[PDB]
Scaffold this active site. Sequence first.
Site, PDB file in Angstrom:
ATOM      1  N   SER B 197       0.814  -1.201   0.000  1.00  0.00           N
ATOM      2  CA  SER B 197       0.000   0.000   0.000  1.00  0.00           C
ATOM      3  C   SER B 197       0.859   1.267   0.000  1.00  0.00           C
ATOM      4  CB  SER B 197      -0.917  -0.037   1.230  1.00  0.00           C
ATOM      5  OG  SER B 197      -1.836   1.028   1.198  1.00  0.00           O
ATOM      6  N   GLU B 324      -8.998  -4.799  -3.855  1.00  0.00           N
ATOM      7  CA  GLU B 324      -8.351  -3.731  -3.128  1.00  0.00           C
ATOM      8  C   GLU B 324      -9.296  -2.683  -2.568  1.00  0.00           C
ATOM      9  OE1 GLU B 324      -5.284  -4.003  -2.430  1.00  0.00           O
ATOM     10  OE2 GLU B 324      -4.068  -4.708  -4.117  1.00  0.00           O
ATOM     11  N   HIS B 437      -7.598  -5.525   0.557  1.00  0.00           N
ATOM     12  CA  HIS B 437      -6.385  -4.722   0.533  1.00  0.00           C
ATOM     13  C   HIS B 437      -5.659  -4.996   1.866  1.00  0.00           C
ATOM     14  CE1 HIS B 437      -3.979  -1.251  -0.707  1.00  0.00           C
ATOM     15  NE2 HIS B 437      -4.224  -0.613   0.422  1.00  0.00           N
TER      16      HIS B 437
HETATM   17  C1  LIG Z   1      -2.387  -3.331   5.221  1.00  0.00           C
HETATM   18 AS1  LIG Z   1      -3.684  -1.541   5.502  1.00  0.00          AS
HETATM   19  C2  LIG Z   1      -3.141  -0.056   3.912  1.00  0.00           C
HETATM   20  C3  LIG Z   1      -3.255  -0.581   7.482  1.00  0.00           C
HETATM   21  C4  LIG Z   1      -5.805  -2.078   5.360  1.00  0.00           C
HETATM   22  C5  LIG Z   1      -6.526  -0.980   4.573  1.00  0.00           C
HETATM   23  O1  LIG Z   1      -6.190   0.322   5.110  1.00  0.00           O
HETATM   24  C6  LIG Z   1      -6.779   1.480   4.475  1.00  0.00           C
HETATM   25  C7  LIG Z   1      -8.214   1.684   5.107  1.00  0.00           C
HETATM   26  C8  LIG Z   1      -9.303   1.847   4.189  1.00  0.00           C
HETATM   27  C9  LIG Z   1     -10.597   2.044   4.632  1.00  0.00           C
HETATM   28  C10 LIG Z   1     -10.853   2.081   6.000  1.00  0.00           C
HETATM   29  C11 LIG Z   1      -9.831   1.916   6.948  1.00  0.00           C
HETATM   30  C12 LIG Z   1      -8.491   1.712   6.541  1.00  0.00           C
HETATM   31  N1  LIG Z   1      -7.487   1.548   7.685  1.00  0.00           N
HETATM   32  O2  LIG Z   1      -7.831   1.591   8.862  1.00  0.00           O
HETATM   33  O3  LIG Z   1      -6.292   1.361   7.499  1.00  0.00           O
HETATM   34  C13 LIG Z   1      -5.821   2.703   4.549  1.00  0.00           C
HETATM   35  F1  LIG Z   1      -6.488   3.858   4.629  1.00  0.00           F
HETATM   36  F2  LIG Z   1      -5.006   2.674   5.602  1.00  0.00           F
HETATM   37  F3  LIG Z   1      -5.055   2.779   3.466  1.00  0.00           F
END
Ligand SMILES: C[As+](C)(C)CCO[C@@H](c1ccccc1[N+](=O)O)C(F)(F)F
Lengths: 532, 528
Positions: B197, B324, B437
């Site tokens: 990400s 994603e 994602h």
């Molecule tokens: C391996 As991660 C890039 C900390 C899971 C997705 O995270 C998104 C997200 C998308 C929608 C709602 C909440 C979140 N979140 O808490 O992380 C974001 F924003 F971090 F990229």
Amino acid sequence: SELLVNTKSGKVMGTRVPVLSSHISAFLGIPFAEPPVGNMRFRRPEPKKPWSGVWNASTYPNNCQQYVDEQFPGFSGSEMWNPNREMSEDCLYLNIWVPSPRPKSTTVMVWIYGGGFYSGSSTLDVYNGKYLAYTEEVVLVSLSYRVGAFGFLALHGSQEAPGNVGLLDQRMALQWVHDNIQFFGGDPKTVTIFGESAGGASVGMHILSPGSRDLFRRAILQSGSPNCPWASVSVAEGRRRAVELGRNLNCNLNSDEELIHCLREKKPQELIDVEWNVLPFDSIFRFSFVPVIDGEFFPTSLESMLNSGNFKKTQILLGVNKDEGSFFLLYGAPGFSKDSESKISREDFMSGVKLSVPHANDLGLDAVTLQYTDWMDDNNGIKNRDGLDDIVGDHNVICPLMHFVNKYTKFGNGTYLYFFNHRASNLVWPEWMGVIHGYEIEFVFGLPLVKELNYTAEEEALSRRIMHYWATFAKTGNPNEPHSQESKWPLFTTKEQKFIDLNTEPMKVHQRLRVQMCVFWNQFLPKLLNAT
Amino acid sequence: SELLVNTKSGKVMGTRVPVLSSHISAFLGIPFAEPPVGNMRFRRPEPKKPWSGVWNASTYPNNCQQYVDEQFPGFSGSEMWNPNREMSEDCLYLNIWVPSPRPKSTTVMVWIYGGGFYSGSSTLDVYNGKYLAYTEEVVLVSLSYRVGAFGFLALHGSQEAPGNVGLLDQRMALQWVHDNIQFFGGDPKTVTIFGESAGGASVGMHILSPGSRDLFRRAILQSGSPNCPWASVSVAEGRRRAVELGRNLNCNLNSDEELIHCLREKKPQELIDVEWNVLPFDSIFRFSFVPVIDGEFFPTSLESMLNSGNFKKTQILLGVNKDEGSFFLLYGAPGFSKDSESKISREDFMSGVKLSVPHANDLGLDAVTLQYTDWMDDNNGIKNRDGLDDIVGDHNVICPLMHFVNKYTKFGNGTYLYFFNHRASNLVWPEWMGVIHGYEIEFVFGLPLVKELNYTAEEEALSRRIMHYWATFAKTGNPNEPSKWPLFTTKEQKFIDLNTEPMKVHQRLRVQMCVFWNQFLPKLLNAT
Ligand SMILES: C[As+](C)(C)CCO[C@@H](c1ccccc1[N+](=O)O)C(F)(F)F
Ligand SMILES: C[As+](C)(C)CCO[C@@H](c1ccccc1[N+](=O)O)C(F)(F)F
Ligand SMILES: C[As+](C)(C)CCO[C@@H](c1ccccc1[N+](=O)O)C(F)(F)F
Ligand SMILES: C[As+](C)(C)CCO[C@@H](c1ccccc1[N+](=O)O)C(F)(F)F
Ligand SMILES: *[C@@H]1O[C@H](CO)[C@@H](O)[C@H](O)[C@H]1NC(C)=O
Ligand SMILES: *[C@@H]1O[C@H](CO)[C@@H](O)[C@H](O)[C@H]1NC(C)=O
Ligand SMILES: *[C@@H]1O[C@H](CO)[C@@H](O)[C@H](O)[C@H]1NC(C)=O
Ligand SMILES: *[C@@H]1O[C@H](CO)[C@@H](O)[C@H](O)[C@H]1NC(C)=O
């Protein structure tokens, strides 16, 4: 006698013709107007003045002056559409086929030939009206109208060349049918005007034009629609082309009066030879002289009229064919030959969209492209060919017709929609062209009923029910016969949007005819080109 | 001992941690910069001043100040991503996992957490590096960096808040690795930076940035590329946001310095409480403070650099997940629920698309709709749900990465693309979200090897081959060890599926849609 008829303007003597081991009356070459010749070229039609004696109506009349096609000399597939009589400016005639025991006061169907408003004849073999007149017991009429510059040069403001005179010719024959068909056993309160291509657009244009409305009861449109991108120009464009025709002929361009006096002296062929020279771009499915939005024949814009319900409210039966665009790609796009599979390369695909959507900026072109390309297999010649075929058919026939059917149904009193997808067993055109523009006609007219033409037995049956749908619609306004054991062709409604397939397979009902692509053409692209 | 290492700035002592019935060494919370606190808020990082005595590196460090997600109090699915350590502006630390006995000069991998540059931590359970370090015998290093305003407030021209400090934090982590990883048994000449990400976008940014190029060898990008729409903003947009942040906290706006000083006074939480207020559009998959194309860290525009080939030429292994966008639609779009199938009406679909492509004008939105709508069945709640899910994922992750992949391959020395589409047997989120994602990360980190986590044997297998692919690629620049994972070439554009079934090789990943997102729509919005 059955063959002698006292019409309003004079006596007409028709002829007895055989039809599938039987006979019916035929009145050919009856004039409905004074010959639009001399200082009359380009002017509104004038009514035929009465004659003494008996008018010999035992033979077809002349076909109007037009661009004769010579792409495939001697090839029946292309020449069956060319003038089969002498081309003369003296050509405003109509023909009528009356079933033998003359009907008391039966249904009338008036056929309006198509051909991009540049060509067409009422006399072609496929328009022989005996089979349908005999079989369905209707009085069949086929009219004629001036084409190309003769019927459509438009110098808006001039009373010498007002434009839309070809459409007025049609209206006059319709008037003639209204004033005389009763003497042939026809019922002037029950006439259906039906036509294909420019003939299909013309029909819709009469449904919109106030001065034509009360001359017919119902309407049938085949592969044509009033709003087709190629069926009309603005008065500006109309004037522009009229002046360019004159430039192309060394005409004095001082005033409309001089441009017209010049053009009127040129020999017919002289105008035809330069006809295509006045178009804006290199294109396919685009014709030089066509109807103009003048504010007279057409009070306002076609779309404004469609939205306001400013049209005749009656029943309409209409439809399209599966591969409406192949006929045009064969003639003007690279890679298309009637002697090969015509697998189109990515290179010619690009060249072809450019030719098919002549009035589109690069952003437009990319949209059309993205919309019809399979980027997982974009080097596939079959897909590229069929992709481009659909493009020409969707843009020029299907979506324009679908926009019209959806607008009309809002105010209409009954709409029936069909999709002709049968490929005739004896077709002379190559297989890739599919169900070609104009090929439901031979079935609408019943040519499969004549054995020596080699249609299959299932094709005879298809033609018979197609003719029955047409005649029953014309008679009652609903193609379905009351309390029948057959399958029902349902009303097309704005909500369900049902239509049927017209082919050999047992009838099937579908919904939302090519919606996806038509949202593109009818909604998105116009908006994209508007934002510019 | 093996848990006592002499780094250049001071001694450090880790701890022996058990791993799958064996042990490995863990050095946790190693400072690599000066605590960026007080005056140092928003400033570029400063190297960690040497220290005397041994630095206790037996436990995880504080996490950086960030917006904590409270959408589902107590739900592991979202809670597992929240800071699991006490937050603090003193959060520039790194962790290391060294196989035991200590290797001599082995492959090094450096993880960069991702969370839209507004969040993320190096201490989450899914980032526990002890499994991968052990299973593949590599030195695993997880870094950390400032997020939100603290790491990306951007008043270009000023020097107290220049912007991109969060990236400089990252670069300083890599410089630390470059200078010290040899003391832990790792080859600084064979370091791989990988992240998911926002972390993936960072990897790509260090490939682009001249000042970062020489600190690493190869790269791995998971569901993110430097050109993602949510990944950066111009100096003007950054500036605009910075000032509006000030306007929100009743700050003096007369000049860069007065604004900055005012923002330094504010407590960390005050800044976070109004962080989202600066976004120009109501939207989803958009974050306030992200990298800025300042003409420094980034010489010219990303695209300009990608085209001229102005970037580190090496091998890259990257990919994306099947769905994603589900996560984003679930949090901010109408019709989406965690406790239902979330079937989407036509009306909610229309809403969804406007929230999804916030920058598009009406014509643009129309185009996006036509592209993803089935006009023969437009009230199908599943088709509409999936359609929106695909819009968000294709526009924000997949297509920007496919544009990066095709441009990079033009000058690169080896690309390997993947498509991860396996949904954990024990996923706690609803089935409609699919392969979410961020959920490939647990496989990359080998969690499926620990039985108490209840994954299936077939999944442990997927985890292992994935860790081997990653590590083998890290060590050699090639995921294969002489069916094989084929090279991606602009001619054949091959890629592989990453799941439990036997490997399948495909071509032209989402080319239809991506031709839309990368070529058509841009040209459309640009004109109109
Ligand atoms: C391996 As991660 C890039 C900390 C899971 C997705 O995270 C998104 C997200 C998308 C929608 C709602 C909440 C979140 N979140 O808490 O992380 C974001 F924003 F971090 F990229
Ligand atoms: C029932 As017809 C409306 C005479 C089908 C073909 O006519 C087309 C056409 C299309 C493409 C190439 C040539 C021609 N043609 O010679 O008639 C046109 F132009 F008349 F509409
Ligand atoms: C001087 As020319 C090569 C007869 C302009 C139009 O040409 C068309 C065409 C030619 C003959 C009949 C109909 C059409 N048409 O409908 O487009 C096509 F297809 F050859 F380009
Ligand atoms: C005043 As808010 C309801 C914390 C602005 C953004 O909200 C997003 C969101 C919230 C949390 C993490 C990531 C995202 N996002 O990427 O869009 C969503 F989804 F709630 F609308
Ligand atoms: C009408 O003209 C045609 C062709 O010249 C001819 O065959 C027919 O007998 C004529 N009718 C009469 C007898 O006037
Ligand atoms: C046609 O008009 C008649 C009388 O105005 C009405 O009863 C009928 O519903 C109409 N048919 C349709 C389908 O519009
Ligand atoms: C190291 O830190 C841990 C946790 O903060 C603490 O429990 C332990 O006593 C420390 N060890 C030494 C001797 O520094
Ligand atoms: C990587 O670069 C080397 C050195 O020029 C070359 O031999 C090799 O073929 C390249 N590998 C690829 C797949 O581009």
